Amino acid sequence: GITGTWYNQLGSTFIVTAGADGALTGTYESAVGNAESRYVLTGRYDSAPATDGSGTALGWTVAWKNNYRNAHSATTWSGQYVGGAEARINTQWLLTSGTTEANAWKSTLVGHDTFTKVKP
Amino acid sequence: GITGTWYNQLGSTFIVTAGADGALTGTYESANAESRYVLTGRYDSAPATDGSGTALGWTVAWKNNYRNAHSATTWSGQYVGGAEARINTQWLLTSGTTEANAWKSTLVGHDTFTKVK
Amino acid sequence: GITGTWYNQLGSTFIVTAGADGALTGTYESAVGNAESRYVLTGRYDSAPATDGSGTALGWTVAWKNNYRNAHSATTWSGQYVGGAEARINTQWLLTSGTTEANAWKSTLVGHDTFTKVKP
Amino acid sequence: GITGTWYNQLGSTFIVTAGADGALTGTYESAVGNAESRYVLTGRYDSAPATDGSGTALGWTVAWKNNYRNAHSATTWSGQYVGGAEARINTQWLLTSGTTEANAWKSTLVGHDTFTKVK
Structure with missing residues (x-):
């Protein structure tokens, strides 16, 4: 399932636990970026997904x-397992x-990450 | 300044506690x-004091x-x-979604929240 | 209609002509940003929108x-009139x-602009 | 290097001409390529990109x-060649x-496409 250690296409490491109550907890x-060592993450996932072949929504x-x-x-990831x-x-x-208000127009970057349980 | 009740432009209500450890917890x-849901996230607990906003999600x-x-929805922004x-x-x-429908799986938009309705 | 002079919430000026064939042409x-004077724009719009109260898609x-x-x-705007x-x-x-490949992860900013024929 | 036919990851094709002035014109x-699936495309690219190894911005x-x-x-693509x-x-x-105003909150989908010169 979702719980486990995942890696994105650039080598970042996503260590996550999916709890019984819909909680995601772990470290990232x-x-890339102005980062070093681990950071706390929290989120939510659908703990009762559809049974028709669909993925499991999370963020x-x-x-x-x-x-x-x-x-x-701060970064938010929105996607599906x-x-x-x-x-x-x-x-x-x-x-x-x-940012200041004058610089808010350039405050937000966007991209896409895919995670697997193997290193890229 | 983050802890409390917030209201967006379309009638939603966003109730949050900003914890000393950077946690956001609450209900949306x-x-x-029937319309209340758990929310969890994170915020910068030591923002700049130069007029810049406080990043959160x-x-x-x-x-x-x-x-x-x-x-599931994720909000990314600043207080x-x-x-x-x-x-x-x-x-x-x-x-x-199924794999065949994944191309249309993600909507994008924007919300502004205020402390008054 | 779409043809006219528009302004966004920051005071940018969008001078556009909507052609009968679905073409958008004009200047922007x-x-904000590393910009001076007018730049060429081109795009497309739905020249036969729905008649149910919906807006007109464009970009x-x-x-x-x-x-x-x-x-x-380069910026692309996607929206509706x-x-x-x-x-x-x-x-x-x-x-x-x-960007270089190493910097591609931070190559794209995202935002939202609303335009009116009156300058706010 | 931009003018020609490109193919995305999901079976779509576009043929584009990159003009000397920065124009992009063509068909998406x-x-299959049947007439009912063909649409006009129009955009712009940086006709004098940097020489430091960076890509060429377009949309x-x-x-x-x-x-x-x-x-x-309508779909807009923003990216680099x-x-x-x-x-x-x-x-x-x-x-x-x-959409109507009541439905505007769900008016916009977001995604990503990668195009190559080979199917």
């Missing part, structure tokens, strides 16, 4: 502050930095 | 108990004890304090 | 190169910069 | 109306449908 270690957030760095920013021989979590993400 | 009501999975849309405080966000809403 | 002047692109500056980037007492074009946009 | 279609729009059908929607023997156009896209 980024391979989570990392605020890029830990005991060693603070980038004044797809089971099978090679399980996969396909996501799109938004990375918002704290 | 998209319109009674949270997730709602659209399942409760009454309904299940097989979908801005002051007399007219706001949380300005962009969001992604992914539905569980 | 940005209130356009600006490459941020003109005779004065070149930011090595909504007729009314206060006509409005509501959009969401993607701004992609030319 | 399905793998284009397709409104999903042709002589045969009308989905009352990367040349070489394994040339690519890497994009993210937004697909907005015309």
Whole structure:
């Protein structure tokens, strides 16, 4: 299932536990950006997905502050878990930095990450 | 300044506690108990003090004890304090789909939250 | 209709002509970023919208190169025109910069612009 | 390097001409290529990109109306072209449908497409 250790296409490490109540908890270690070591993540997933072959919807957030760095920013990943021989979590993400109002127009980056249980 | 009740532009209500460890926890009501859902997320607990906003994000999975849309929304944005405080966000809403329908699985939009209705 | 001079919430100026064949042409002047004076835009719109009260879908692109500056980037706006007492074009946009592969993960900003024929 | 036929990961095809002035013009279609699947495309690209190894920024729009059908929607692709023997156009896209105001919150889909010169 969702619980386990996942890697995105750039080598970031996503260590997640999916709880009975729909909770996602764990740590994220980024391979890019103003980041170093692990950061806390929390999120939610559908704990009773459809039974028609559909994926399992989920999302989570990392605020890029830990005991060693603070980038004044946060990423959310929104996506779905797809089971099978090679399980996969396909996501799109938004990375918002704290800005002044005049700079808010350039506050948010967008991209897509795919996660598997093997290193890229 | 984040902890409390917030209201978006379309009649939703966003109730949150910002914990000392960077946690966001609370409930989201998209319109009674049938419409309330758990939310969890994170925020920058040590933001800059130069006029910049406070970065944050949270997730709602659209399942409760009454309904299940097989979908989840993430909001990514920043809190801005002051007399007219706001949380300005962009969001992604992914539905569980088959592989053939995955290309149309994700909606995008934006929400602005205020402390007054 | 769509043809006219529009302004977004930051004061950018969008001068557009909607042709009978579905073509959008005109110029864009940005209130923000590495930009000066007018830039070419081209795009498309639905020349036969639904008759059920729905808006009119459209989109356009600006490459941020003109005779004065070149930011090595391009924005696309995707949205719909909504007729009314206060006509409005509501959009969401993607701004992609030319980058190296190592920097591609942070190549794309995302936002939302609303345009009116009155400058806010 | 942009002018020619490109294929995405899901069976769509587009033929584009990159003009000297920065114009993109052409047609977007399905793998089958039947007339009912073909739509006009129009966009812009950076006609003087950097020389430091960066990609070439571009974007284009397709409104999903042709002589045969009308989905009352339009997609914009925003991305960069990367040349070489394994040339690519890497994009993210937004697909907005015309909606009433009550339904505008769910008017816009987002995704990503990768285009290659080979099927």
